[PDB]
Design an enzyme around this catalytic site. Sequence first.
Site, PDB file in Angstrom:
ATOM      1  N   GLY A 164     -14.938   7.256   1.402  1.00 54.33           N
ATOM      2  CA  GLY A 164     -13.670   7.121   0.510  1.00 54.33           C
ATOM      3  C   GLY A 164     -12.679   6.540   1.014  1.00 54.33           C
ATOM      4  N   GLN A 165     -12.655   5.954   2.512  1.00 53.72           N
ATOM      5  CA  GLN A 165     -11.622   5.360   3.072  1.00 53.72           C
ATOM      6  C   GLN A 165     -11.278   4.111   2.499  1.00 53.72           C
ATOM      7  N   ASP A 166      -9.710   3.832   2.732  1.00 54.00           N
ATOM      8  CA  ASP A 166      -9.448   2.714   2.072  1.00 54.00           C
ATOM      9  C   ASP A 166     -10.052   1.364   2.532  1.00 54.00           C
TER      10      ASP A 166
END
Lengths: 180, 198, 415, 570, 18, 142, 10
Positions: A69-71
Amino acid sequence: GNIFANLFKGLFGKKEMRILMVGLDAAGKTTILYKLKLGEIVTTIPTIGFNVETVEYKNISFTVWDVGGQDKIRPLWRHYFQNTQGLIFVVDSNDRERVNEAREELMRMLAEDELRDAVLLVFANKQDLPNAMNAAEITDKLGLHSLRHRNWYIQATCATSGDGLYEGLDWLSNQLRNQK
Amino acid sequence: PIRLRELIRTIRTARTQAEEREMIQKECAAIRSSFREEDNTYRCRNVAKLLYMHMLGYPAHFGQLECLKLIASQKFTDKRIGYLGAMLLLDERQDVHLLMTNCIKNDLNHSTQFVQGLALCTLGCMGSSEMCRDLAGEVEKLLKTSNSYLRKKAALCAVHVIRKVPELMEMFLPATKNLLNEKNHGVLHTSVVLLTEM
Amino acid sequence: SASAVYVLDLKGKVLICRNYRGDVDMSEVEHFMPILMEKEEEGMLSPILAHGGVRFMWIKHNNLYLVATSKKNACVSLVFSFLYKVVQVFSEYFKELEEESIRDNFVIIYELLDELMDFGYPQTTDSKILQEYITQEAPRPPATVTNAVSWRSEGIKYRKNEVFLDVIEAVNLLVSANGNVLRSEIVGSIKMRVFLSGMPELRLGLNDKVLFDNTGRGKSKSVELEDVKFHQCVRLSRFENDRTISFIPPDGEFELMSYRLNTHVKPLIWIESVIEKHSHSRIEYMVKAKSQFKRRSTANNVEIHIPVPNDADSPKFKTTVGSVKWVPENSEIVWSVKSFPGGKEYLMRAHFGLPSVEAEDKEGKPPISVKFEIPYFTTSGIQVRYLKIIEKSGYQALPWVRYITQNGDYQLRTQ
Amino acid sequence: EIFELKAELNSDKKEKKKEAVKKVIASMTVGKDVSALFPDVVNCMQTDNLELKKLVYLYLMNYAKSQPDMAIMAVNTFVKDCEDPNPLIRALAVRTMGCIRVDKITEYLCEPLRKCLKDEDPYVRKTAAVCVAKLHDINAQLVEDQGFLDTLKDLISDSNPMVVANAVAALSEIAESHPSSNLLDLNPQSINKLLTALNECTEWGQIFILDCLANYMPKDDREAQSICERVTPRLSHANSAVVLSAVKVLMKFMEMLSKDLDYYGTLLKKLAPPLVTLLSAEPELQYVALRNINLIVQKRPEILKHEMKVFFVKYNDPIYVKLEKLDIMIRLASQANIAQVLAELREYATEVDVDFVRKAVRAIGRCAIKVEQSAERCVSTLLDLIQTKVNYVVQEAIVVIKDIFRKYPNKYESVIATLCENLDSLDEPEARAAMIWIVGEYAERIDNADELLESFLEGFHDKSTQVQLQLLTAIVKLFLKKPTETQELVQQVLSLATQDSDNPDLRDRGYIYWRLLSTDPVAAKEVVLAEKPLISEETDLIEPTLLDELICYIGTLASVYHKPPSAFVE
Amino acid sequence: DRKGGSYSQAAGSDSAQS
Amino acid sequence: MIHFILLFSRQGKLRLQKWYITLPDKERKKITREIVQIILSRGHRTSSFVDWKELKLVYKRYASLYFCCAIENQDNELLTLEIVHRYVELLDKYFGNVCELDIIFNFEKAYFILDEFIIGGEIQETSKKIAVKAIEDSDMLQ
Amino acid sequence: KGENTSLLHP
Ligand SMILES: Nc1nc2c(ncn2[C@@H]2O[C@H](COP(=O)(O)OP(=O)(O)OP(=O)(O)O)[C@@H](O)[C@H]2O)c(=O)[nH]1
Ligand SMILES: [Mg+2]
């Protein structure tokens, strides 16, 4: 043509199916995948890239492709949208500020014309703290009932305990397989 | 799944540029058809054919996700093919190597000395400004080991990280101290190169 | 005014050279290859090169470039015509135009090159006439070359007198992406295979609009040929006087006249194609082919080429009539139809995938070209009226002709 | 190898001599220096078989300049072969004699040339005519001494139309290198005689017959009318060069024709179908046809006025033809087909050729500048191209807008707002300078002209000399027009271009601007921000003197390049 | 038979025009 | 460090390529074409050293197929030639009578050997037998 | 041919 070999293979089980693992970071996606595959709460570093695994249950190979769920990895979910039949959404009910971001990401991923046959799979992760919502408040906030032509199902799974994983797997198998 | 030798012979059998381009496109169509089906058995042959086509001067943009998928695989041949594809058709400006950081981290702690060495070589060859930032901690761990075959790879990775990130040299000072007594010539050469770079 | 006619190859090696004036050094051919390579890599490549004070004007053949060096202000059109005549002579003598015959037919090739042009000025170019004096398997030259009639050898005798004509039509349509046709011209081609005894003087007669107006019958169906290009045997003076097409047909197959007039009618085949190409997800090809031609005519071997994506893979074709196959070599969908009756409507629904990663450079939108060929259908409506075959000896000829309608530059601009 | 070949060639067996000759011929073609064996092949030259004689003659011709001394052993053989009863042998001997570039051999070949000049065989006559021209080119003095000019002149007035055409071509070639003294021109009777044999000449003889009339200049309309009537049938020839030669002859003869009579109109009407037919030729001849059309378009633009659909570039057309198509469309562009030209240019802007895209943009700009009735359409097309988000297309649109604004800026204020924010980050010197000039001259409809120029002033000292000059001019214009919001900007520009600027021209311009500002800012409005006169557009039409000379040179190298014949030959 | 249209016999001249 | 290594044939075809600098594909192709043109347009007495783009381009071909390198102007010139000779010897020992035919078909093996020998443009193993043993062990793994 | 020859001939 002859389909005797196909019938023989299906007499003992031939369908495998697929699955996806997407959601916000620190949402229990890696822990949920480890519990589904192994059955233990394994502590892992944040998923910079992605994790690919498979689960064998009910004679169906439920392959899970964990997505962080990293940018920098949020827009990379379109890479796994090719040749994908299933999709599992991991919600973060313990992050009130990140709930809106997760809902926006789910809406963005669900607003693509390429991913249409992938049924909705909402998993209530981090179901161990009193601040976690029920199976209807989260769905009502996310508006899962407003997803036209989308078969979504909200299931609460505890990362530490593992309860509800069997129900979610059975629901996914019933949604994917339409036979006896 | 056509073999690499068969594809090379077919390419060599083409005389005109148009005929060679037509053969390359015909092979790439089959490669793309195999890749779109999520093939995992003959993936090495398809990867080799795509790499050969790219080296001969043909586009290979579609064969980017396949290399990433093969990198996180378990087969040794598939892992080697994925590493070669990442080293050849993958670069800092590609923009698809961000997801390869997780694969490198997973393969950096592998017990096998070949998968870890291949991952370290790929990281050194295609080091990015952001991959080294999230891989500096793992590089220093391998630099303090007593593996002669891995000491040179760790030194090369540290040198590449320092070249890409000049501000990361502060984390290598306490790791290279007391490393000039290596009996192996390769380890001593790597240590000397790292000291000169620092 | 060519100085040295030479034949090159794909690797820059001169297969055969034949200097005609000697004013250009034979070592200038070596610089032609680097000059051509530099021109191609910069977009300035042209058929006529320039190596300092010497110009290398030549055309591109199947496997070798027939570059003819020159130094003075020689006629470029004359050099091109000489090169075309040499290519035609080679094709007539050798069934294949490649390096396989250049290195194997040098004995006859050198003789043909020497006899064709002397001092840069060609003198003999008829393959049929040239085959009677230069053979690869020598008597005095035939009187046909010395005589005025250099396209019909005298003394030809046959058991029967049958002449087969071929009225081949070329339907070329330039349809823009907006749906309108910009360039819609039909070029006629009257190719006849004359096989008679002696030297008959054919008197071609058709329902020309000018001829009908002159005779006073300018009210029926007459072909309005804007441009008419007669062959060498056709007398220009006779055509200019009273539209009299009188000429001696040659021995074999040759092009007598080549009509070319604009067409203001609707296209025979109308293609309605749509492109529902998703952004890196999928693509849709709702291509529908409408046959506007007469129902009595069938377009045999109809092939409407639909340009699909270059990187498209796993394509699916949902058509109605005719087999649809995608060729990765051409990067297009070939809508091949065996029999296309007039007035028929074929609907196709293409569906192909696309890689997630976008392409590095644009590929363009090649036009969609159809390959319709309906025999026994004359779009221009020109019909042969008479063929006056007159011979001094006197014989009953049996002329024949067939009308074939096909597609020429019938391309459809894409969106 | 060499010794074995020499032994085989020096044998008494014809089967081995033929094989040796074939091997020697193949070695020369394969790229082997076989000139060392020239004396050995000289002995095996006088052979009865015609198959080996041709190879020996070819080897001698190709090995004549290399070993001129060893070529002295072939004059007797050539003399003997020049009297053979077979016309083919005599023609081959005549061709080989003229093909040998030997100074000491052509002197003794005058007698065989004179003997074959009056040969009864038409092939022998043509061979002698070719050999006479070859000898004249090799040695003009020897040809003049031999008196071959009189024999060549009588060739045109004899039978054998092919031989007559060959003699005419040889005479034209000799006169081409001649200094114009004692020209071979003929009266109207000679022209009529040549025209009478024009309809009986072959495809190659037609060019020779029509090239002679290219030098003659008619003096009366009746003669010009007859010449036009006789050349009219040549427009229906299958040969591409014949049609071009006929068109050139008609154009040359039209200089003496009278436009009042109906002959000029008939000639103009009968020439357009010929151009249309020539436009559908081979791709190699497509460039030649386009060059001929461009050369004749500037002289008689009323013939192909309605020919616009055929000028559209095809999808499979070559680059050399696609580029010429845009020029042809621009030359024939008018308000009648302005919409068609704009549609063609719009389609040509979606291709992938950068050179093709630039050519299309230039053609669109030229059409917009030439025709003021389509200025709005051209501006809209340029705006659409700029909005297309193409770097090359954006630069081309910026250049076109800058060119149009200087020519038609009265109603160009409606596009400044759109161009105010149009991806100004492009570093193209031809586009950034144009944008700066447009902003400086059009600094009235943009309220953020000073803010926009701030980004371009960061690297004004190292951007470019032309770019720096344009930025300084724009800053000066903005200060003169609006000095409240650009009071400090003008001072900063003067400081950067006068103190840190080492460019001589740029430094002088900055000093002049500073002096004007410090002397009389009010006068700077009438001096710097003055109403410039109408900009004289660069006319693409050639000079009338060059056009008249280029008319006679049609289908040659001087016509494709659009240059004089003496400015390209060496 | 033959692809492209069967061959048809041609006349000798315009009999209706004398 | 070696900026890039390109193994090109005499005809201009490239049988190997390994660049240690992240460059665009079009830019890399243009650089390779320029290097091939410069090497193909040079004599046999050019010293095997070319200063192209401020890079010590060293060319030393022992057969029909040539070799190229891009060494920065901070180390000795003979070092690049020694490294190239050592790499050629190691490839010959690993393959056994290495020719041009085996290079095209066995390009993967050559790439693996180069990766195991030089990583990031710098040398990884000074010895010639240790690298061969490591390559053999890696190949025998399956 | 020229390709089957050894690179170093050792
Ligand atoms: N103690 C506890 N922590 C949980 C539970 N559920 C989720 N978490 C948190 O969720 C995180 C799960 O991370 P991982 O299993 O490594 O994989 P992930 O969910 O994709 O997280 P990222 O790797 O950052 O993308 C853990 O670090 C926990 O802090 C739970 O039931 N008990
Ligand atoms: Mg995870």
